[PDB]
Write an enzyme that holds these catalytic residues in place. Structure first.
Site, short mmCIF file in Angstrom:
data_model
loop_
_atom_site.label_atom_id
_atom_site.label_comp_id
_atom_site.label_asym_id
_atom_site.label_seq_id
_atom_site.Cartn_x
_atom_site.Cartn_y
_atom_site.Cartn_z
N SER A 84 9.12 -11.19 -30.01
CA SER A 84 10.26 -12.06 -30.38
C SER A 84 11.49 -11.63 -29.62
N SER A 85 11.81 -10.33 -29.75
CA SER A 85 13.10 -9.78 -29.22
C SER A 85 13.06 -9.64 -27.69
N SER A 135 35.54 -6.88 -31.71
CA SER A 135 36.56 -7.14 -30.70
C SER A 135 37.17 -8.60 -30.93
N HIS A 149 16.15 5.47 -29.58
CA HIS A 149 17.62 5.64 -29.37
C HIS A 149 18.33 4.33 -28.76
N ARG A 160 15.27 15.09 -46.29
CA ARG A 160 15.24 13.66 -46.43
C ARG A 160 13.77 13.37 -46.69
N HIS A 179 11.92 -0.18 -46.36
CA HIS A 179 13.40 -0.37 -46.46
C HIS A 179 13.92 -0.35 -45.01
N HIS A 230 17.27 14.10 -28.57
CA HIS A 230 18.06 14.62 -29.71
C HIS A 230 17.40 14.30 -31.11
N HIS A 231 16.34 13.46 -31.12
CA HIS A 231 15.50 13.12 -32.25
C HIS A 231 14.34 14.14 -32.43
N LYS A 261 36.58 2.18 -26.77
CA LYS A 261 36.54 1.02 -27.66
C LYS A 261 37.39 1.15 -28.91
N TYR A 297 21.71 1.64 -30.43
CA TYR A 297 22.81 0.96 -29.65
C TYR A 297 22.60 -0.56 -29.72
N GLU A 344 17.42 1.47 -29.45
CA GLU A 344 17.45 0.58 -30.65
C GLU A 344 18.73 0.80 -31.40
N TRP A 394 9.70 5.19 -41.04
CA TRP A 394 9.76 4.13 -40.01
C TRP A 394 9.41 4.65 -38.53
N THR A 437 32.84 5.34 -26.16
CA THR A 437 32.92 4.78 -27.52
C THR A 437 34.39 4.96 -27.98
N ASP A 470 23.13 -25.35 -24.22
CA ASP A 470 22.15 -24.77 -25.10
C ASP A 470 21.80 -23.48 -24.41
C1 HEA Z 1 24.32 1.99 -35.32
C2 HEA Z 1 23.31 2.92 -35.16
C3 HEA Z 1 23.75 4.27 -34.60
C4 HEA Z 1 24.70 4.61 -33.69
C5 HEA Z 1 25.60 3.62 -33.01
C6 HEA Z 1 24.60 5.98 -33.51
C7 HEA Z 1 25.49 6.77 -32.73
C8 HEA Z 1 25.28 8.20 -32.51
N1 HEA Z 1 24.38 9.01 -33.08
FE1 HEA Z 1 22.98 8.48 -34.43
N2 HEA Z 1 21.51 7.78 -35.45
C9 HEA Z 1 21.23 6.59 -36.02
C10 HEA Z 1 22.06 5.46 -35.77
C11 HEA Z 1 23.16 5.49 -34.89
N3 HEA Z 1 23.64 6.55 -34.26
C12 HEA Z 1 19.96 6.49 -36.72
C13 HEA Z 1 19.22 5.34 -37.52
C14 HEA Z 1 19.53 7.81 -36.73
C15 HEA Z 1 18.31 8.47 -37.43
C16 HEA Z 1 16.97 8.00 -37.10
C17 HEA Z 1 15.90 8.51 -38.04
O1 HEA Z 1 15.49 9.71 -37.96
O2 HEA Z 1 15.24 7.76 -38.83
C18 HEA Z 1 20.47 8.54 -35.97
C19 HEA Z 1 20.17 9.92 -35.71
C20 HEA Z 1 20.93 10.72 -34.75
C21 HEA Z 1 20.59 12.02 -34.35
C22 HEA Z 1 19.31 12.81 -34.73
C23 HEA Z 1 19.70 13.76 -35.85
C24 HEA Z 1 18.44 14.33 -36.40
O3 HEA Z 1 17.49 13.58 -36.69
O4 HEA Z 1 18.49 15.57 -36.44
C25 HEA Z 1 21.54 12.40 -33.44
C26 HEA Z 1 21.47 13.65 -32.65
O5 HEA Z 1 22.32 13.88 -31.78
C27 HEA Z 1 22.44 11.33 -33.32
C28 HEA Z 1 23.73 11.36 -32.67
C29 HEA Z 1 24.56 10.18 -32.50
C30 HEA Z 1 25.70 10.16 -31.65
C31 HEA Z 1 26.27 11.30 -30.83
C32 HEA Z 1 26.17 8.87 -31.67
C33 HEA Z 1 27.38 8.35 -30.83
O6 HEA Z 1 26.86 7.17 -30.15
C34 HEA Z 1 28.66 7.98 -31.61
C35 HEA Z 1 29.97 8.07 -30.70
C36 HEA Z 1 31.08 7.68 -31.63
C37 HEA Z 1 32.09 8.53 -31.95
C38 HEA Z 1 32.26 9.94 -31.50
C39 HEA Z 1 33.21 8.01 -32.82
C40 HEA Z 1 34.24 7.16 -32.02
C41 HEA Z 1 35.02 7.95 -30.98
C42 HEA Z 1 36.29 8.42 -31.09
C43 HEA Z 1 37.21 8.05 -32.22
C44 HEA Z 1 36.73 9.17 -29.80
C45 HEA Z 1 37.00 10.65 -29.94
C46 HEA Z 1 35.83 11.46 -30.43
C47 HEA Z 1 35.42 12.66 -29.97
C48 HEA Z 1 36.04 13.41 -28.84
C49 HEA Z 1 34.25 13.37 -30.59
N4 HEA Z 1 22.11 10.37 -34.19
CU LIG Z 2 19.43 8.82 -31.01
#
Ligand code: HEA
Ligand SMILES: [Cu+2]
Ligand SMILES: CCCCCCCCCCCCCCCCCC(=O)OCC(COC(=O)CCCCCCCCCCCCCCCCC)OC(=O)CCCCCCCCCCCCCCCCC
Ligand SMILES: CCCCC/C=C\C/C=C\C/C=C/C/C=C\CCCC(=O)O[C@H](COC(=O)CCCCCCCCCCCCCCCCC)COP(=O)(O)OCCN
Ligand SMILES: CCCCCC/C=C\CCCCCCCCCC(=O)O[C@H](COC(=O)CCCCCCCCCCCCCCC)COP(=O)(O)OC[C@@H](O)CO
Ligand SMILES: CCCCCCCCCCO[C@@H]1O[C@H](CO)[C@@H](O[C@H]2O[C@H](CO)[C@@H](O)[C@H](O)[C@@H]2O)[C@@H](O)[C@H]1O
Ligand code: CUA
Ligand SMILES: [Mg+2]
Ligand code: NA
Ligand SMILES: [Zn+2]
Lengths: 98, 84, 79, 58, 259, 46, 105, 49, 144, 43, 514, 73, 227
Positions: K156-157, K255, K240, K438, K61, K290-291, K319, K244, K242, K126, K316, K91
């Site tokens: 590819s990527s 946007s 990580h 999980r 999945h 953080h993972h 944005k 972003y 990935e 995964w 963020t 192109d």
């Molecule tokens: C689109 C994909 C995506 C994105 C963009 C992000 C964005 C972030 N992620 Fe996440 N993340 C995942 C996809 C994503 N993550 C995936 C797939 C996993 C799990 C992987 C797995 O184990 O299989 C994961 C797991 C993951 C973990 C591991 C947790 C664990 O396994 O224990 C953590 C730990 O810090 C983390 C943190 C964050 C943070 C801080 C952001 C930040 O970038 C977000 C910042 C955004 C905001 C804060 C909101 C907007 C801001 C405001 C409105 C401003 C004001 C806000 C404040 C002052 C707080 N993420």
């Molecule tokens: Cu991460």
């Protein structure tokens, strides 16, 4: 210590590379490699937009450093004005590589 | 560093050839000397079946499964020790 | 000679979450010590703190594997 | 050797509609056909092998 | 008729044959590792070589023969080759990181020391130092080749390039002979694992770089290169310097510091 | 040269909406169904 | 950037140009309604008279429309504006949207 | 000239809603789904030992 | 008045409250009386009738502000249709419960739950707030 | 955006058909596997 | 003709079309896998009766959604259609290499399908962590087929990334600087730099896993002196960036869609939005551990990774507030693309916020490997990304095809999807706080109610997905051809008509310097 | 017939924004107040009160006597 | 343990887990204010016919919107890192217990004095005693003294696992070749449950952890009787 035997672009460049080279030599730019310079862009002194057909897209950067570019098709005929800043552009059609 | 030589007037083809034959290839000749002179078979160590070495978690996809790809019988013992 | 042992005390040499080197070091100290004594016709009893410390800390299967490898002559640390 | 690039420039700029990978002549065709036969044949055979490996061979 | 300087490429089968050759090589390594067979893998390797050959042959037809490489095109290809070397430096970085991870914190199974108990490393001042001087020398000669070409000197470009290629081959045969002589193997723990995987991928890159310089040698023999337009030669030189720098990091890291 | 314009820059036909229905059915239906038949396949091997 | 009085005079002059052309009429109105204000009657007055010089009755009514639109929910604004333009409207013979039934949907 | 929404809007809104409420209440209450809600205020604890 | 695909590069008509004076007139070819109307417009607008004035507006513009800004009944079709497909989903779930899912574990039987609830309270599960906190151990009942 | 009237209008009836056939193409094959899961589990 | 056009393509738009088709079909596979997950969990007890199959379903999945749905659609699909049109380029730089990046994907997908058909599949998660992914706990071809699948998707990527960086740097009009290109084109360039730098490290690590499993190396095997945790660092060093990569082109599309349907010529604070994407892309490289907050890491390392992760919230937020500021004052067109974008602003913000809760290594002890993490990433990743893709698809569909959608049907589709994803994932927060792990095929009885509701939400999103397929059919069935499009003066990609000719910008645009 | 007074005609959107952003800040203070009292302080007081007179031996004896432990009957 | 319809964390059994609850309460209040401010502004921007579409200056507003988040983040990081260093401070445990993960069960070693060890398997559902908890009970619980600082050392003899007890705030991965340490202190006697938290193959869902916390004298006798 020295000696020759390697061709030069003058001798061996061909196709479009050679066309661009020979045009640069005469200070012409038929393949749009350089940015055109603006005129004052008034009705009397329109920016002149070469084209090989009867309409070409213009992007106008109204002011230096604007990040937004204003895009419009410029048609053969009377001068048209940018929809944002009014500067004038007139199309000067036609032709290319004899 | 400048190295300990001089020139810099210009780094053209003549200068790079001068370096090739006057520094680079002479170094290679020296190191070829030094090597093929500290060569000659050093005497092999007692086999000890250490569990961190001679790993076999799956047979290799070639030969009898138990010899490494560039196996050298003189210096590469099998897990059971040097070959007969 | 200064006892009342409950468990291995904090050791500032190994202050973090991975304690593998703490277990390993006390196993080594015990057996090095017991080599020194046994040989010098001294007495194994002075080696006791390390025995207590490593038995508390070391997984049984690790002590048991390292003990087999010492008997076998394939133990990789220096004793 | 002599410089035959001009001959080659003429061959490849010949206005015959051929795409570049076939513009050198009949040999480009043979090599193209050997390459595409091997990729397509080998791809059919990888599918066969997945078919084979998808099932226990007791 | 276009009036920009970019290249519209003819529709081509080589992307699909290269994609299928990837499928056949990877499924073929699976068949080799698991199903005791080399058949799929040999076909994939063969299609991969056919694809590379026709593909880069066409690029040369487009440039040398058809004149599609205007300066804007050439600048594109420069960025392309630099971006690619950057991706390769990152690939290498993950193997350096594996090496440093294992060696700076040796585990109990190793004896708790680096080099592990029972490993006898090669002497870095022997063949390894020879290999360093051989690659550094090839960086000097290829730079001589480059200045000869820019200066219009056909015979010295050729001779400096031949010498570069001979030094690449010599490094390959020295390393092949080291691999055979080494008393440790890829299966000797993380020592052997890091040593052979890192040096082996570096070895592969020396072979790819020497093939790229050999292709430039033959193109130079047929007068493809002008004294000002010779990007395939510059790309091969950049890639060669890449391989020379990875070697220096390998030598300092694994052979010297890790001995 | 190649066909251009709505309905012509795509690798499938939109000439008949019922034949396109069948096509889109097979296309999306076969991606959606595939994991079910993979689970069935694995459950049937034991 | 400027006082309200200066902004309004800038725009008054803009529309008062005697030979203002049709493009310049549309550019002024379209740019003006981008701002966070309802245009003063004096600006509107100049733009209506520009419509007169340009023989365009339709755009004069549309201008009155866009005034009402720019006021949003502030219902008191448009009738105030119309009040103020009444002498111009009478003089040029411009009917309001409401007088032409173009306010019904 | 009435569009689709003028003609069918009221009807689509009112039956979609009736229909949706009906079939969810039925799924949730009549077909044996065990929601496992809290025992608090609802289960009489019984000797287990 | 007919708009064609071949005209995409040319300025076009739009009704937008934020672009009130579009690039072209709504009606490009005038009838003979529309033309004389254009002619009349060159004289005092006070001599035009209400219908002439209305018809001068309609030649320049397609819809008025009131018209182009009007609200519709689309929201009713969207919300009732979304409800309808959500209700259809529940038919799917009713199907899956009936034909796919078998019986759940015996631990959800009423008597098991009563016993399990007693054992959770005997072990004082979540005693500060969550669970046992909600049982009156003096009065032997759920806290009111 | 403005567009031309449909070149080949799809009447409500035709839409009910395309919608119903689309839904069955996802529902039936998966229904079939899921309905027979026990037949699979106990083979 | 057909083979030449569609198999030998060197055209950016057609290649983009094939990526959209591939990604759509992947999204059906991924959706079916997600429904299998939620069926298994939809009531207490076992459904599949086979938890190795459940874990294979979970793993596939995720690989299908990320590598075969999101990246191809966003970067292969929108990137290729839109990027050259938006810079007036004829192109891509490497239009023939562009076509190998496309063609490597079906074979990559076929390998992943093969891994699940052979032996007992790869039920690894995964992350594919050793030793569970090694040759004793996963003997046989399945895990190595997964590794090769990811090798092909990686090449590819990486070739895509080179082509897009080069195209965007080298092929704009001579007058347009980088600070005159559209936010979507910057979002692609920055995704590409992340892909270029992060994939080669994933590649090194999975190649080490392949050699552990097949050549008796022991990088990750303590018997030879290796360490399982080295693998996690190499994987998350890529994983990580990935995440972003998966959201950045969706931020570029949002946007564009908010600016457009707000009736604005430009996004509020353009250079703030460029800076925010670059800042996020940079920080995205120094946060990966953080993972790994429960693997046994020193207290100072945890403190640093917590503080660096949180900082990402600053750029963020610029944005999010700048999208609100672009709506501000607009003449709002409530189109179905706009609704996708507004639901994106809110739901991404929810999910980024629970990411900031998890960034706290102290709370993450208790939340790590529970459904609170699954909830976090289905908000910010599955909905963020999916809502950006749906908004971009409904917005640009008429550019790519020449035909309009029915907007009423598309509003209906949005409503249904919105209800579904929130019914599906919101309860998963409660499951995670209350301790449900999980990667589980069944759960203690106390977790039944939120799992039941989450499974019923899954079915709602399924209905929305069937409906989308019908909506697209109805568009092609009816053939309503586009006549006029507003705001083309600031949306260059629309200016050559719908669909634009095969070759556009054969004569380039004219832009002056002054 | 009386004249209409001149109304505010400029910056109406900016005015509207300022007003609501301000009201949004108020509402944020209110909610924090409510939330500290309804969640955060409630929790502190729940734990404080629970432990103030807690007797862990008595709690154990009651659990022992309900037959819950493997190690204590 | 968790209970039906639970919304938040298990009640805290340890002073650390209590700290986490109060830190979660502070951070959740921030998360709710921010997400609802964003939803509110979205509705605010979309609810007016007033327009302003000319170019807007960004460099004033971007200050507020960078400083204010920066401050909020600091206000979360301060208590966050206080807890973090507090969990980390030198503890002096009275006891050390090892747990080894296996596929799919835990073993425990208490080897400070005697050689005590045993395995701890899930009770199959068909074998549960009335009132016992599906997927959670084990045959041999981890008995431990209450109100005492215990050092737990965690490892594995095959693939990764992770040893977790939510109500004590605990989770520490179990890695073959590695010995991770964590410390455990219960304020209360009772039965505290957890489950394996790192995927380790087909029975990942079925290898729970049960702590049985009792007075030291019971623990001592229980130990003696397990030799
Ligand atoms: C689109 C994909 C995506 C994105 C963009 C992000 C964005 C972030 N992620 Fe996440 N993340 C995942 C996809 C994503 N993550 C995936 C797939 C996993 C799990 C992987 C797995 O184990 O299989 C994961 C797991 C993951 C973990 C591991 C947790 C664990 O396994 O224990 C953590 C730990 O810090 C983390 C943190 C964050 C943070 C801080 C952001 C930040 O970038 C977000 C910042 C955004 C905001 C804060 C909101 C907007 C801001 C405001 C409105 C401003 C004001 C806000 C404040 C002052 C707080 N993420
Ligand atoms: Cu991460
Ligand atoms: C789906 C099933 C719903 C079940 C609800 C609870 C049942 C109560 C019984 C039971 C009776 C109550 C008595 C028990 C007290 C609980 C003590 C506790 O320890 O408490 C800790 C709890 C606190 O939890 C709650 O207090 C539940 C309320 C949920 C938070 C607010 C969102 C409201 C929307 C929910 C609708 C459903 C999906 C839509 C949500 C949309 C996405 C956010 O757990 C959480 O922290 C989870 C939060 C996750 C973090 C997400 C943050 C941002 C959310 C979005 C805000 C949107 C703004 C407007 C919101 C806009 C509305 C659309
Ligand atoms: C002399 C210079 C070196 C050239 C290398 C020669 C051999 C064949 C080709 C491959 C080259 C490089 C690949 C690197 C990976 C594997 C290790 C290779 C380095 C090497 O050759 O190591 C040899 C082991 O080889 C072995 O296993 C060989 C096993 C061969 C199987 C190849 C591995 C296939 C899997 C790798 C696929 C690569 C995927 C990378 C994808 C790129 C990312 C997109 C060492 O010999 P030994 O007997 O152990 O010790 C010597 C004791 N006398
Ligand atoms: C024994 C064999 C086994 C080895 C396996 C792999 C095989 C070896 C591959 C060796 C690479 C050969 C590359 C040949 C490229 C030749 C075409 C060429 O060089 O093309 C040039 C453009 O460069 C360009 O495309 C630049 C082209 C870039 C090529 C980059 C090559 C690197 C490929 C590396 C593969 C890496 C895999 C790594 C494993 C992790 C042509 O432009 P100019 O030269 O300016 O000519 C024009 C003038 O004549 C006009 O006056
Ligand atoms: C997660 C995605 C799935 C969502 C829910 C799927 C919804 C169900 C759609 C219907 O699917 C079908 O329904 C059947 C019964 O209703 C089946 O007939 C079976 O049932 C019969 C009657 O009981 C027999 O007539 C037949 O043999 C037959 O196999 C069956 O084949 C199947 O295709
Ligand atoms: Cu053991 Cu999961
Ligand atoms: Mg984990
Ligand atoms: Na289940
Ligand atoms: Zn302009």
């Amino acid at each position: 210590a020295s000696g020759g035997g390697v061709p030069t672009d003058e001798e061996q460049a061909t196709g479009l590379e050679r066309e661009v080279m020979l045009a640069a030599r005469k200070g012409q730019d038929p393949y749009n490699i350089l940015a055109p310079k603006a005129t004052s862009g008034t009705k009397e002194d329109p920016n002149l937009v070469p084209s090989i057909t009867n309409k070409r897209i213009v992007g106008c950067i109204c002011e230096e450093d604007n990040s937004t570019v204003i895009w419009f098709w410029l048609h053969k005929g009377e001068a048209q004005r940018c929809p944002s800043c009014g500067t004038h552009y007139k199309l000067v059609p036609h032709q290319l590589a004899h | 560093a400048s190295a300990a030589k001089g020139d810099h007037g210009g780094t053209g083809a003549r200068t790079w050839r001068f370096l090739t034959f006057g520094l680079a290839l002479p170094s290679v000749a020296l190191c070829t000397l030094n090597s093929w002179l500290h060569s000659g078979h050093r005497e092999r160590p007692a086999f000890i079946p250490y569990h961190h070495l001679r790993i076999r978690t799956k047979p290799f996809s070639w030969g009898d499964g138990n010899h490494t790809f560039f196996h050298n019988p003189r210096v590469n013992p099998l897990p059971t020790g040097y070959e007969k | 000679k200064i006892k009342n042992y409950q468990t291995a005390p904090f050791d500032s040499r190994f202050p973090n979450q991975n304690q593998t080197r703490n277990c390993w070091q006390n196993y080594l100290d015990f057996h090095r010590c017991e080599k020194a004594m046994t040989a010098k016709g001294g007495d194994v009893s002075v080696c006791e703190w390390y025995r207590r410390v490593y038995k508390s800390l070391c997984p049984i299967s690790w002590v048991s594997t390292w003990d087999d490898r010492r008997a076998e002559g394939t133990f990789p640390g220096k004793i | 050797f002599e410089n035959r690039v001009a001959e080659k420039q003429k061959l490849f700029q010949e206005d015959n509609g051929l795409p570049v990978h076939l513009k050198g002549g009949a040999t480009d065709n043979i090599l193209y056909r050997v390459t595409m036969t091997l990729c397509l044949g080998g791809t059919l055979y990888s599918l066969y092998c997945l078919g084979w490996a998808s099932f226990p061979h007791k | 008729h276009q009036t920009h300087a970019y290249h519209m490429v003819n529709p081509s089968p080589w992307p699909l044959t290269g994609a299928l050759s990837a499928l056949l090589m990877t499924s073929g390594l699976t068949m080799w590792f698991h199903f005791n067979s080399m058949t799929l893998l040999m076909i994939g390797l063969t299609t991969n070589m056919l694809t590379m050959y026709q593909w880069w042959r066409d690029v040369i037809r487009e440039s040398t023969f058809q004149g599609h490489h205007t300066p804007a095109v050439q600048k594109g290809l420069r960025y392309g080759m630099i971006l690619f070397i950057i991706s390769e430096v990152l690939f290498f970085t993950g193997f350096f990181w594996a090496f440093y991870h294992s060696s700076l914190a040796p585990t109990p199974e190793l004896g708790g020391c680096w080099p592990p108990t029972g490993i006898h490393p090669l002497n870095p001042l022997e063949v390894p130092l020879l290999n360093t001087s051989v690659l550094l020398a090839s960086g000097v000669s290829i730079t001589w080749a480059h200045h000869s070409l820019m200066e219009g000197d056909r015979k010295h470009m050729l001779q400096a390039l031949f010498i570069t290629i001979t030094l690449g081959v010599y490094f390959t045969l020295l390393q092949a002979s080291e691999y055979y002589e080494a008393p440790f193997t890829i299966s000797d723990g993380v020592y052997g694992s890091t040593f052979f995987v890192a040096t082996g991928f570096h070895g592969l890159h020396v072979i790819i770089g020497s093939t790229f310089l050999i292709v430039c040698f033959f193109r130079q023999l047929k007068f493809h290169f002008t004294s000002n337009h010779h990007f395939g030669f510059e790309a091969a030189a950049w890639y060669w310097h890449f391989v020379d720098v990875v070697w220096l990091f390998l030598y300092v890291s694994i052979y010297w510091w890790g001995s | 040269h190649y066909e251009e314009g709505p309905g012509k820059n795509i690798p499938f036909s939109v000439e008949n909406k019922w034949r396109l229905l069948a096509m889109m059915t097979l296309f999306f239906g076969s991606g959606f169904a595939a994991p079910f038949f993979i689970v069935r396949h694995q459950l049937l091997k034991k | 950037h400027e006082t309200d009085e200066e902004f309004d005079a800038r725009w008054v002059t803009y529309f008062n140009k005697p030979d203002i052309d049709a493009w310049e009429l549309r550019k002024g109105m379209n740019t003006l309604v981008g701002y966070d204000l309802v245009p003063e009657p004096k600006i509107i007055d100049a733009a209506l008279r520009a419509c007169r010089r340009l023989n365009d009755f339709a755009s004069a009514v549309r201008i009155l429309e866009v005034v009402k639109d720019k006021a949003g929910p502030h219902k008191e604004i448009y009738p105030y504006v119309i009040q103020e333009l009444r002498p111009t409207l009478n003089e040029l013979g411009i009917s309001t949207p409401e007088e032409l039934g173009l306010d019904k949907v | 000239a009435p569009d689709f929404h003028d003609k069918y809007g009221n009807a689509v809104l009112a039956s979609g809603a009736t229909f949706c409420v009906a079939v969810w209440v039925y799924m949730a209450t009549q077909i044996g789904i065990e929601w496992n809600p809290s025992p608090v205020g609802r289960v009489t604890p019984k000797e287990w030992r | 008045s007919v708009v064609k695909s071949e005209d995409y590069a040319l300025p076009s008509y739009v009704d937008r409250r934020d672009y009130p004076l579009p690039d072209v007139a709504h009606v490009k070819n005038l009838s003979a009386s529309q033309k004389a109307l254009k002619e009349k417009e060159k004289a005092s607008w006070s001599s035009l009738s209400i219908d002439e004035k209305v018809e001068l507006y309609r030649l320049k513009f397609k819809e008025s502000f009131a018209e182009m800004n009007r609200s519709t009944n689309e929201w009713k079709t969207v919300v009732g249709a979304a409800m309808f497909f959500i209700g259809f989903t529940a038919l799917l779930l009713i199907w899956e419960k009936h034909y796919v899912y078998g019986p759940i574990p015996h631990t959800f039987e009423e008597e098991w739950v009563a016993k399990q609830t007693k054992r959770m309270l005997d072990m004082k599960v979540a005693p500060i707030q969550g669970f046992s906190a909600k049982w009156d151990y003096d009065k032997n009942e759920w806290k009111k | 955006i403005t567009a031309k009237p449909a070149k080949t209008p799809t009447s409500p009836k035709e839409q009910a058909i395309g919608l119903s056939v689309t839904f069955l193409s996802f529902l039936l094959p998966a229904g079939w596997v899921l309905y027979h899961l026990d037949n699979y589990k106990k083979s | 003709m057909f083979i030449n056009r569609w198999l030998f393509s060197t055209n950016h738009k057609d290649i983009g079309t094939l990526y959209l088709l591939f990604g759509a079909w992947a999204g059906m596979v991924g959706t079916a896998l997600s429904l299998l997950i939620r069926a298994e969990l939809g009531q207490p007890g076992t459904l599949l009766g086979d938890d190795q199959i459940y874990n294979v379903v979970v793993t596939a999945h995720a690989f299908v959604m990320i590598f075969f749905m999101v990246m191809p659609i966003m970067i292969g699909g929108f990137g290729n259609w839109l990027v050259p049109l938006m810079i007036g380029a004829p192109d891509m730089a490497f239009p023939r290499m562009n076509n190998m990046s496309f063609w490597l994907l079906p074979p990559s997908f076929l390998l992943l399908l093969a891994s699940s058909m052979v032996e007992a599949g790869a039920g690894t998660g995964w992350t594919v962590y050793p030793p569970l992914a090694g040759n004793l706990a996963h003997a046989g071809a399945s895990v190595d087929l997964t590794i090769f699948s990811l090798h092909l998707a990686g090449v590819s990527s990486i070739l895509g990334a080179i082509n897009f960086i080069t195209t965007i740097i080298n092929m704009k009009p001579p007058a347009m600087s980088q600070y005159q290109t559209p936010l979507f084109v910057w979002s692609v360039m920055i995704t590409a730099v992340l892909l270029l730098l992060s994939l080669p490290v994933l590649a090194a690590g999975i190649t080490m896993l392949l050699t552990d499993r097949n050549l008796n190396t022991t990088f990750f095997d303590p018997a030879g002196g290796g360490d399982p945790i080295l693998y996690q660092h190499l994987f998350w060093f890529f994983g990580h960036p990935e995440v972003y990569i998966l959201i950045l082109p969706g931020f570029g599309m949002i946007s564009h869609i908010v600016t457009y349907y707000s009736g604005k010529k430009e996004p509020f604070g353009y250079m703030g939005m460029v800076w925010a994407m670059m800042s996020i892309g940079f920080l995205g490289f120094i946060v990966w551990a953080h993972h790994m907050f429960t693997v046994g890491m020193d207290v100072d390392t945890r403190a640093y990774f917590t503080s660096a992760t949180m900082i990402i919230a600053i750029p963020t937020g610029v944005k999010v507030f700048s999208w609100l500021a672009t709506l501000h004052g607009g003449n709002i067109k409530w189109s179905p693309a706009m609704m996708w974008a507004l639901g994106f602003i809110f739901l991404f913000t929810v999910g980024g916020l629970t990411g900031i809760v998890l960034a706290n290594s102290s709370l993450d002890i208790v939340l790590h490997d529970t459904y609170y993490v699954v909830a976090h990433f289905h908000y910010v990743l599955s909905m963020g990304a999916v809502f950006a893709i749906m908004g971009g698809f409904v917005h640009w569909f008429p550019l790519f095809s020449g035909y309009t959608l029915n907007d009423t049907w598309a509003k209906i589709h949005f409503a249904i999807m919105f209800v579904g994803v929130n019914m599906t994932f919101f309860p998963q927060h409660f499951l995670g706080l209350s301790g449900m792990p999980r990667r589980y095929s069944d759960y203690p009885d106390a977790y039944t109610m939120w799992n039941t509701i989450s499974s019923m939400g899954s079915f709602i999103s399924l209905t929305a997905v069937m409906l989308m397929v019908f909506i697209i059919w109805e568009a092609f069935a009816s053939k309503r051809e586009v006549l006029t499009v507003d705001l083309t003066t600031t949306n260059l990609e629309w200016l050559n008509g719908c669909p634009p000719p095969y070759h556009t910008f054969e004569e380039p645009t004219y832009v002056n310097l002054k | 017939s009386t004249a209409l007074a001149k109304p505010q005609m400029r910056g109406l959107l900016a005015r509207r924004l300022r007003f609501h952003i301000v009201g949004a800040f108020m509402v944020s203070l209110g909610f924090a107040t409510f939330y500290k009292f309804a969640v955060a302080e409630k929790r502190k007081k729940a734990y404080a009160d629970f432990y103030r007179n807690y007797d862990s031996m008595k709690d154990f004896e009651e659990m022992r006597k309900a037959g819950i432990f493997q190690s204590a009957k | 343990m968790a209970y039906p319809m639970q919304l938040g964390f298990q009640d805290a059994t340890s002073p650390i887990m209590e700290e986490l609850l109060h830190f979660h309460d502070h951070t959740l209040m921030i998360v709710f204010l921010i997400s609802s401010l964003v939803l509110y502004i979205i509705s605010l921007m979309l609810t007016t016919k007033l327009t302003h579409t000319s170019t807007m200056d960004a460099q004033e507003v971007e200050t507020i919107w960078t400083i204010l988040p920066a401050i909020i983040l600091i206000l979360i990081a301060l208590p966050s890192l206080r807890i973090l260093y507090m969990m980390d401070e030198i503890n002096n445990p009275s006891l050390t217990v090892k747990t080894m993960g296996h596929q799919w069960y835990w073993s425990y070693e208490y080897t400070d004095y005697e050689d005590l060890s045993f395995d701890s398997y899930m009770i199959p559902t068909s074998e549960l005693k009335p009132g016992e908890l599906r997927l959670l009970e084990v045959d041999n619980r981890v008995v431990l003294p209450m109100e005492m600082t215990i050092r737990m050392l965690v490892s594995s003899e095959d693939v990764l696992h992770s040893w977790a007890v939510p109500s004590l705030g605990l989770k520490t991965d179990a890695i073959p070749g590695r010995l991770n340490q964590t410390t455990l202190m219960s304020s209360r006697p009772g039965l505290y449950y957890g489950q394996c938290s790192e995927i380790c193959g087909s029975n990942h869902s079925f290898m729970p952890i049960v702590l049985e916390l009792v007075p030291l004298k019971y623990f001592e006798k229980w130990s003696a009787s397990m030799l």
